[PDB]
């Protein structure tokens, strides 16, 4: 038909014929086949106004003017029905069964995809693109919605792994890359809106998570005794969901931002924490075990590093951009820790772990002697660290303290994540540690050795000499000293069978080449050693293996 030159009696009778079809509806139509008729009523409604074509106002064409503009408006509000319809095939579902079974998320099928983008390409054609796509970003909205609505319960709810933000944020993921894969399937490849659709749909979902989010964040912050190493499952989450939004385009971006900042600084204080944990706890008994035995503060604080080695990933991950300062007292002391500039890549997440746990490790032990030594030592100001302290007049048991829980600290090492978190400089700052505070128990024996080479010394400076009273004197001297020191070293029994070797190493050492020389340069000042020598240095010797075991 030539619509320019057709009587309004043959073109309203062409609109009835067309209209019969129509009222049949778009299945039994066909859905192309739907459109093309719309389009002819559509092109024959331009055709016939305007200004081009100028027909008569009577009523004979305001009739099929008005016809042609409602059969149109009816037939497309159908098409939008037929479009929603589609689209709600979908029901709202568990995404967790899904998950637990390992199944995908129901998806359309071709047909209905196809039927989708030639409704989406309609209506984009009659300049109704935003219109329909409202509908499509609408739909698709609340569905997804309700799905996440049998999470969000179990969600706002400390158990490695107990939360439903791991599962949560799993069914989060998935809607996310599906949806991705919806909108390629549904627009040509480079359709410019298809970022803009792709984000009407998350944002809403991204504006809800984040709220959860910011609550589990709340929680954390209030019962953070038992909640505090659940930001480390927070991160991943946040990680994950932010991983999987790469290359698209977001509304409220921000709010993830933001929700990035607030956990990297809770997990950030953790470590900070755990420092000023062991300060106040090695501080907060001012009295010392009677045993010298493992205290309170050793246990806690072992218990607590043994959680952050479970955590491994995390704390790892953790250290990003987080430094040594970041959990060191703003008071710190160098001689307060075992680190010793060997150069190490301090760019290394594992080498910035293990100093963590080392310099937990060294705060622990140096304020447990603080304590012992205010605690022994009221009115003294506290000389750490020194094995070398004449000021300080008990680093025989203070050094056994120290040591006795150094060796729980040792042993829950060894028994956890942590005895390979600390592989290399973590085990040898560890050692050496021990050795400072093996060298406390020591420190005693060495004055009491330098005391008798002194002696010798002075007087050893003229002709060998004959004074027997004086001489019988600087064993006299000695003798006191040794009885002295094997008495008190007998009420320190060590658990740990190496550390009691090198302790019986170091003392033998020190005393027994000393005594022999000291033995042999001045026996025969008399004619019977035996009555003016308490000990010959066999007799000594045996004193010393019977200490020592």
């Known amino acids: 038909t030539l619509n320019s030159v057709a009587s309004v009696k043959d073109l309203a009778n062409e609109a009835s014929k067309y209209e019969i079809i129509l009222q049949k509806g778009i299945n039994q139509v066909g859905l192309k086949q739907y459109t093309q008729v719309v389009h002819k009523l559509d092109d024959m409604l331009e055709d016939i106004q305007s200004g081009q074509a100028n027909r008569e106002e009577n009523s004979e064409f305001h009739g099929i003017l008005t016809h042609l503009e409602q059969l149109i408006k009816r037939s497309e509000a159908q098409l939008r029905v037929y479009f929603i319809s589609i689209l709600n095939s979908i029901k709202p579902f568990d995404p967790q069964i899904n998950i637990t079974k390992k199944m995908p998320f129901p998806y359309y099928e071709d047909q209905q995809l196809g039927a989708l983008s030639w409704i989406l390409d309609y209506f984009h054609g009659n300049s109704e693109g ?6 499509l970003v609408g739909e698709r909205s609340k569905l997804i919605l309700k799905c996440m609505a049998f999470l969000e319960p179990f969600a706002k709810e400390y158990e490695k792994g107990s939360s439903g933000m791991n599962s949560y944020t799993e069914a989060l993921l998935g809607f996310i890359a599906n949806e991705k894969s919806l909108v390629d399937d549904l627009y040509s490849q480079y359709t410019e809106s298809k970022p803009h659709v792709l984000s009407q749909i998350l944002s809403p979902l991204i504006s809800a998570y984040a709220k959860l989010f910011g609550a589990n964040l709340k929680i954390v912050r209030s019962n953070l005794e038992n909640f505090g190493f659940f ?8 990680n994950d969901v932010k991983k999987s939004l790469r290359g698209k385009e977001l509304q409220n971006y921000n709010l993830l931002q ?33 045993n010298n035995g493992v205290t309170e503060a050793t246990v806690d604080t072992m218990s607590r590093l043994r959680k952050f080695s479970e955590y491994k990933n995390g704390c790892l991950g953790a250290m990003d951009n987080i430094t040594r300062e970041n959990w060191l ?15 190490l890549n301090w760019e290394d997440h594992n080498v910035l772990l293990s100093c963590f746990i080392s310099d937990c490790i060294d705060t622990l032990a140096v304020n447990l002697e603080r304590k012992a030594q205010i605690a022994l030592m009221p009115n003294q100001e506290p000389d750490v660290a020194n094995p070398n302290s004449s000021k300080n007049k008990h680093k025989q048991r203070i050094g056994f303290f120290i040591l006795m829980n150094l060796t729980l600290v040792e042993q829950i090492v060894e028994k ?13 700052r560890l050692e050496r540690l ?67 070797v090198t302790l019986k ?45």
């Open 130 to 135: 935003s219109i329909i796509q409202d509908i």
């Open 231 to 238: 930001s480390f499952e927070l991160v991943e989450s946040i």
């Open 258 to 290: 933001d929700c990035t900042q607030e956990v990297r600084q809770v997990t950030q204080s953790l470590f900070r924490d755990a420092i000023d944990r062991i300060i106040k706890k090695a501080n907060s008994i001012s009295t010392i075990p009677s």
């Open 329 to 343: 007292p703003s008071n710190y002391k160098e001689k307060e820790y075992t680190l010793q500039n060997e150069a």
């Open 416 to 428: 956890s994540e942590l005895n390979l978190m600390l592989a290399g400089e973590g085990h040898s």
């Open 434 to 500: 021990k050795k400072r505070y093996i060298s406390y128990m020591v420190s005693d024996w060495r004055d009491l050795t330098a005391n008798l080479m002194d002696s010798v010394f002075i007087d050893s400076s003229g002709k060998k000499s004959k004074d027997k009273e004086q001489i019988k004197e600087k064993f006299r001297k000695f003798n006191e000293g040794f009885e002295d020191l094997v008495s008190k070293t007998k009420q320190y029994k060590l658990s740990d069978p190496s550390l009691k």
């Open 505 to 549: 190493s170091e003392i033998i050492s020190l005393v027994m080449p000393m005594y022999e020389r000291f033995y042999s340069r001045y026996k025969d000042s008399f004619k019977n050693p035996r009555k003016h020598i308490k000990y010959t240095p066999d007799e000594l010797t045996t004193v010393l293996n019977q200490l020592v075991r």
